[PDB]
Design a protein around this ligand. Structure first.
Ligand SMILES: CCCCCCCCOCCOCCOCCOCCO
Ligand SMILES: CCCCCCCCOCCOCCOCCOCCO
Length: 623
């Protein structure tokens, strides 16, 4: 048996050993230290500071700090000002003196970059909440935003789902401009002393007279003593949040809206209300005790995604469709299907619910990637209740079809969330504020649809293929919206095109395959650093990683190049780097939350992607 077959066997065993008893897989989702620095400030604001938890956060913050005293958005990344400021503030709050060495190094970096005035809106706002920055200088999000109807400019349904609940809860918070002063010893006036002139970070899409004027007017309005209908607007914001709280207590299964909603409830004197109580208590599910004694808070949690990918990888590796561990995973997945309408129903009010979310319980926010991967995984299994499996797949498939956007692609949560307005408000200087269709999500949908044998005679698929063709870059690659980066998008897109019957001998696909081969590293693997999002010199370039090597391999295998020196060397790379336990290490992030601003380490990718790629490789070589 060739070396790759034994490597595969060991990967399969390792992946099965990671499965939880209930049937799902779930790895920690890594990001950056602003999650934990903001949890420290949240504890301060809510007056619920647990000393033992603070010690573990201190230990984690220091462990994440690099030797030059800075923190980054991803492992090996450039020093990040916003992140370093928040870690410094949380450390001083926990108890480190500004005279300790780690604090001095951090401060030197912070002051070298223009301090607190050069930091993003959310960092200044967290400081305003604790009395360290003026609320008058934070861009206003007025509660009267709730009066804008669904076809009005800047209404909440023009924002992407992850920004929408944030806008609603912050409209309550900014309405009151609450201040929860820090103890004297934790104050940070030193963050205003700068080496260089501070420079305000602006809106990602660029501001403009009308937007600066509106922001100025909203601050002037804020100063008035009477605000007609403001209370009514606040009640709409509160009701909107109360109706949509997720079953785990979060808002949308993600850190920002959750923390801001809890502050909004605190400010409204609702700490004895079940939404606040359950919202507070649910936080522990997202915390992770680390092996070196630290504690972290997950930006989000990925069990459905981890599970659907693991099933696909194990099926590709050779486990039968009725393997008992996969049957258990399949039955667990069937119970996660959502049968109620979510915010997506604003654009699709007659579309029958059938999606899946990322987290365990988040019914109002199913997403296209999880639905595609779960429907596809279910299609590879044989379960005891076949009629239930078929009905689930039909409902999920139909829900994906109904969520297709007008340009032929799919966004993650909504249809046609393409408004250009949210990009120009002062508030939006960080991350993405809208959810337009992207290449990788579209490609995953096509892989799912392709698994049922459909092709571009079906206009849904044809429109999607034309969208991918228009988005292909000049060098032949495809961008990675949610995975790192041109390797991820290129790998997803070529697999998708192959899966729906496109002839991979066409020149545009051959060009993408050559792009993949030209980026292979000397060690035989492929890698792509997160610097790729802001620097063209890093396109398809970085230290090799198991997951990015797997993506490149999948592009080559889908393109008919399994029997090529490039694929042989990639397989050998995976063989040679596999750990004794059958898994792989991956100290670099290969996930993307927001291009340029927020990166993710999906800890299962290093095991599930190599298993998947090696299984596809084996099948291509055997056939
Ligand atoms: C009976 C109450 C009034 C309901 C009438 C609806 C009137 C429509 O709009 C007027 C108020 O809305 C203005 C919104 O504030 C600006 C939005 O967001 C600011 C930038 O983030
Ligand atoms: C603003 C910093 C806090 C970051 C939270 C932003 C949350 C944005 O979503 C990113 C993580 O959640 C993944 C959701 O979408 C689908 C999951 O499948 C993944 C790739 O297609």
């Amino acid at each position: 048996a060739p070396a790759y077959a034994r490597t595969l066997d060991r990967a399969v065993e390792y992946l099965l050993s990671c499965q939880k008893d209930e049937g799902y897989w779930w790895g920690p989702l890594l990001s950056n230290v602003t999650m934990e620095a903001e949890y420290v400030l949240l504890c301060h604001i809510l007056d619920r500071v647990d000393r033992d938890r603070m010690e573990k956060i201190r230990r984690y913050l220091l462990h994440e700090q690099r030797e030059d005293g800075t923190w980054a958005l991803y492992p090996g990344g450039p020093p990040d000002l916003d992140t370093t400021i928040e870690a410094y503030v949380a450390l001083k709050y926990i108890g480190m003196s500004r005279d300790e060495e780690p604090m001095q190094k951090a401060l030197r970096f912070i002051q070298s970059q223009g301090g607190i005035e050069s930091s993003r809106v959310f960092t200044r706002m967290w400081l305003a909440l604790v009395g360290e920055y003026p609320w008058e200088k934070v861009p206003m999000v007025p509660p009267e935003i709730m009066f804008l109807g669904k076809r009005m400019p800047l209404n909440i349904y023009e924002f992407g789902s992850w920004a929408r609940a944030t806008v609603v809860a912050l409209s309550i918070v900014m309405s009151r401009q609450p201040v929860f002063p820090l103890p004297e010893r934790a104050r940070v006036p030193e963050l205003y002393e700068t080496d260089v002139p501070p420079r305000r970070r602006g809106a990602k899409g660029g501001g403009g007279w009308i937007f600066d004027a509106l922001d100025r007017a909203l601050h002037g309005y804020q100063k008035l003593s009477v605000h007609p209908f403001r209370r009514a607007a606040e009640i709409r914001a509160l009701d909107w949040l109360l109706e949509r709280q997720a079953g785990d207590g979060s808002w949308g299964g993600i850190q920002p809206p959750w923390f801001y909603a809890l502050i909004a409830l605190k400010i409204l004197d609702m700490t004895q209300h079940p939404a606040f109580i359950k919202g507070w208590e649910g936080l522990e599910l997202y915390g992770v005790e680390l092996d070196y004694g630290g504690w972290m808070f997950q930006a989000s949690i990925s069990p459905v995604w981890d599970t659907g990918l693991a099933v696909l990888a194990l099926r590709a590796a050779g486990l039968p469709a009725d393997h008992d561990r996969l049957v258990k995973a399949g039955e667990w997945l069937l119970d996660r299907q959502i049968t109620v309408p979510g915010d997506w129903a604003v654009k699709r009010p007659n579309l029958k619910p059938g999606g899946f979310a990322f987290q365990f319980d988040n019914v109002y926010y199913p997403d296209v990637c999880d639905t595609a991967v779960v429907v596809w995984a279910l299609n590879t299994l044989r379960l005891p209740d076949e009629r239930r499996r078929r009905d689930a797949m039909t409902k999920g498939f139909r829900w994906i079809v109904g969520m297709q956007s007008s340009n032929g692609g799919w966004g993650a949560y909504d249809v046609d969330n393409t408004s250009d307005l949210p990009n120009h408000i002062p508030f939006s200087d960080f991350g993405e504020v809208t959810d337009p269709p992207s290449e990788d999500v579209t490609a995953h949908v096509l892989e799912c649809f392709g698994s049922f044998g459909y092709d571009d005679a079906w206009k849904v698929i044809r429109r999607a293929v034309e969208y991918l063709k228009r988005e292909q870059k000049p060098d032949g690659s495809w961008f990675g919206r949610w995975g790192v980066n041109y390797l991820y998008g290129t790998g997803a897109v070529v697999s998708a095109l192959k899966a729906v019957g496109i002839d991979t001998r066409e020149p545009y696909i051959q060009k993408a395959l050559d792009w993949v081969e030209q980026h292979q590293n000397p060690d035989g693997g492929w890698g792509e650093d997160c610097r790729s999002y802001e620097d063209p010199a890093y396109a398809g370039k970085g230290a090799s990683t198991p997951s990015q090597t797997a993506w490149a391999l999948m592009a080559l295998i889908a393109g008919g190049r399994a029997e090529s020196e490039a694929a042989r060397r990639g397989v050998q790379y995976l063989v040679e780097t596999q750990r004794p336990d059958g898994g792989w290490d991956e100290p670099y992030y290969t996930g993307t939350g927001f291009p340029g601003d927020f990166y993710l380490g999906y800890t299962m990718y290093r095991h599930v992607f190599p298993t998947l790629a090696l299984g596809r490789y084996k099948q291509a070589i055997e056939r």
